[PDB]
Design a protein around this ligand. Structure first.
Ligand SMILES: [Ca+2]
Ligand SMILES: [Cl-]
Ligand SMILES: [Zn+2]
Length: 212
């Protein structure tokens, strides 16, 4: 491998695995709080082994734990940092699409928790940052904002029933927000709290094969 200059000087630390089949979506992976850019690598394998993988480590630290944007407390985001980091990530997919010579307009995100949130934030703020997105246990990134039209864009949302972190009503609030902007939104339910489960990944694979 020799994309060494970028890997060291880009706006964001990440790993890239060029895929067996370039025509398939580049899978953008976004860890949850306190994880890292390797956590979700198993997910991509289960979802589309042939697909290119771009996996990113967030630029913010909360008590030693990688996060994609600052929060004061669970569910209370720094809204100025959120937009700045959403922009930052969008401007980074720009440079990574050039540097690794893949199609800027064909990227699909698999995020978990905090990682899912910035992914949903991209959907909200930047019309064409993502072709689609798998959101494992997301929240509403921000309220009261005009979304652009998400016409040909498909979103998978996996949420939990007995979840001490995200209320199921807020998970549906997210669905509705997204549909009102003409996204096609599939929604799967698990009843095992906030943990990311095999159950959901298998349903995401299924969904993914049908949407792309
Ligand atoms: Ca500490
Ligand atoms: Cl978060
Ligand atoms: Zn959850």
């Amino acid at each position: 491998t020799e994309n060494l200059y970028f890997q060291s000087n880009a706006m964001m630390k990440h790993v890239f695995q060029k895929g067996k089949d370039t025509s398939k979506p580049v899978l953008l992976l976004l860890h949850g709080t306190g994880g890292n850019e390797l956590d979700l690598l198993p997910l991509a394998e289960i979802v589309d082994s042939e697909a290119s993988v771009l996996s990113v480590r967030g630029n913010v630290l909360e008590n030693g734990m990688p996060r994609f944007f600052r929060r004061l407390a669970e569910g209370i985001f720094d809204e100025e940092d959120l937009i700045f980091r959403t922009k930052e990530l969008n401007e980074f997919l720009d440079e990574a699409a050039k540097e690794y010579k893949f199609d800027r307009n064909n990227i699909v995100a698999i995020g978990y928790s905090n990682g899912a949130n910035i992914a949903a934030s991209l959907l909200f703020h930047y019309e064409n940052a993502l072709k689609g997105a798998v959101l494992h246990h997301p929240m509403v990134p921000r309220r009261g904002m005009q979304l652009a039209n998400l016409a040909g864009k498909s979103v998978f949302i996996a949420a939990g029933t007995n979840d001490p972190i995200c209320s199921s009503a807020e998970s549906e609030e997210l669905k509705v927000l997204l549909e009102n902007a003409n996204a096609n939104v599939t929604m799967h339910w698990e009843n095992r709290g906030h943990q990311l489960t095999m159950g959901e990944v298998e349903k995401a694979k299924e969904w993914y094969d049908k949407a792309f």
